[model samples]
Target chain A: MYVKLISSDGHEFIVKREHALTSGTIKAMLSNEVNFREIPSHVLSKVCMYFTYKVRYTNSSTEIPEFPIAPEIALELLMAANFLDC
Target chain B: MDVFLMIRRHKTTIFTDAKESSTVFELKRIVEGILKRPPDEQRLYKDDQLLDDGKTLGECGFTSQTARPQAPATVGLAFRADDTFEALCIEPFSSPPELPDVM
Candidate 1:
């Protein structure tokens, strides 16, 4: 299946559940006790988007610098990942 | 000397050395070490301030008062695969503002 997530910059991306699960943010959101939805509505940013891309696609490769994701975006993503259990 | 060497390789932790003598670059180095990543790929920030590449950690602003040992110097945030954000880029114009009508 797929989910819809919004970004701070107001962009939307629809991706498969499996791919979204690669992110800790979406995992946590999906699993959170407070959250009650099969799909999530998360607002992300370009930096977060890029970071997720880096993490999932570059596993065998060297770790990405981990600097491109802005601190605010990072924090939000962390919370989301933790919430989703991803 | 070993400490410096390890720090250079970014292998210990993500915080700056507790000693006052440590440089901002050292702080970045430590952060890179803990994250097991490199500075070029990471984005370091002090609150809302973004650090430029190759700037000393001190110049990036670290102090006992504000800097934390385990706090994130980089990659504090996370993301999921499906999420995305969009940004708009346009030059300023003097013409009337365009507003969309709500139906």
Candidate 2:
């Protein structure tokens, strides 16, 4: 399923549950749920604060590239993951 | 802290703590702080491989390693994105007192 995620920086994005589940923590939390909706604000906040900012993304020509998220924007991914139960 | 410097050359981003006397463990802590993970929980990798927390600034393979002798044992970090890359400056051994007035 696709969900709309709002970032603290006010950027909006639509992403898939599988893409969001790339986070190990979220994957673990959502492993059992068949249908999930609505993300917790705290998870979004912390994820934004952590993964988004710290990890760097790289891509090669014609390769499926990972998303480049800033620590400031990672909150959006977390929120989406939480909402989609991914 | 000597001043947190953000480096982005060739589309690679690196956030570094330039304080003199900061340790590798401290850099890991700072990375955790930015990543929002606990200091002990964060992992660092160089060349896509996990790096130990004991290497000093001069030991981590920085281009400027031998130039600064007065520098405390700090870390030299690099972030990469395909062909694009950038480096971070880690000042060693001396952490500055926090300025509570800014926040």
Residue B58 displacement (Å), model 1: 40
Quality class of the docking in candidate 1, CAPRI style: incorrect
Q: Write the per-residue lDDT of candidate 2 for residues B3-103, one digit (tens) a residue.
A: 22332222222334344344556666665544344545544544444457776533444323322212212223454444554444222211223434543
TM-score quality measure for candidate 1: 0.27
TM-score of chain A of each: 0.40, 0.29
TM-score of chain A of 2: 0.29
Stretches of candidate 2 off by over 4 Å are A1-86, B1-14, B19-21, B63-103
Model 1: CA > 4 A from native: A6-11, A23-43, A46-58, A72-74, B1-103
Pick by DockQ: which candidate is best? 1
Q: What's the distance in Å from true for residue A11, model 1? A: 4.9
lDDT tens per residue, model 1, B15-94 = 11334355544555555444444544444444445546466544545543333222222212111223442222221212
**Leading candidate by lDDT:** 2
